[PDB]
């Protein structure tokens, strides 16, 4: 059993706090400002579909490098197969849930290359909004200012309707080609 990180204190029963919703009312475990293994007070680490995609690959590519070290003593359709083989070399057949996620992340990635992602993250995580709001802006493709305000209700009063429209067009130009 795990259940660690943000623990203590449970002072009898407790009314479960509140419901988990997209109105920034997140779980009693997921806070905007949380702790760290080092001990520092770090901001919530939320990633969108293109951000997280490159994050999981970075680890699994490095995993194959380390696992084979101890043994001694791009493109649309080609990315699908390369990831499929990579999951077989690092993880066992038991992890079915990971295979479904990788297939989904690569198919719906708004920004395939790491080069584009850097600027995207420097464009959104600068505005002064919640890290999860970013994880939905970079995930969901929005053309209208009102489209983004409806899908991500956490905004509405947080950002100006026109100022947000400026951002939407930049991500449209930043978009990857499939």
């Amino acid at each position: 059993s795990t259940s660690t990180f943000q623990t203590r204190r449970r002072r009898l029963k407790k009314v479960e706090e509140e419901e988990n919703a997209a109105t920034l009312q997140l779980g009693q475990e997921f806070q905007l400002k949380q702790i760290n293994h080092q001990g520092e007070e770090e901001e919530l680490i939320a990633l969108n579909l293109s951000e997280a995609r490159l994050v999981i690959k970075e680890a699994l590519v490095e995993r194959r490098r380390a696992f084979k070290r101890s043994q001694k003593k791009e493109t649309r359709e080609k990315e699908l197969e390369s990831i499929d083989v990579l999951l077989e070399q690092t993880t066992g057949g038991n992890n079915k849930d990971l295979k479904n996620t990788m297939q989904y992340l690569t198919n719906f990635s708004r920004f395939r290359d790491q080069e584009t992602v850097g600027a995207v993250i420097q464009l959104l995580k600068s505005t002064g909004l919640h890290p999860f709001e970013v994880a939905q802006l970079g995930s969901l493709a929005c053309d209208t200012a009102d489209e983004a305000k409806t899908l991500i209700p956490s905004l509405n009063n947080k950002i100006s309707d026109d100022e947000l429209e400026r951002i939407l067009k930049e991500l449209s130009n930043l978009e990857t080609l499939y």
């Binding site: 059993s1 259940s3 203590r8 204190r9 449970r10 009898l12 029963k13 407790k14």
Partner: protein, 97 residues
Amino acid sequence: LRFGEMERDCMIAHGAASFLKERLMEASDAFRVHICGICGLMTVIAKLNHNQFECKGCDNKIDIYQIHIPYAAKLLFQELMAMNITPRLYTDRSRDF
């Protein structure tokens, strides 16, 4: 053979913590029970096959811990529970001192 009060005190004086525990637990009582992380009481409905480890009046199947305690100690906590006294067993330190 009884390992009474006098028999305990001598093994204490020696400084032998494990033998005293071994005579009191494994060689005598010893019981493996499930305790709640929230209420801290043995209220746990622990099912070892269907894994339904729910606690009535907590609903959780997460914060649950197994413990190696004597049958006489468990019985004492149950006797005090019947006497409107709550000996809420807490695994975590909340005062340090």
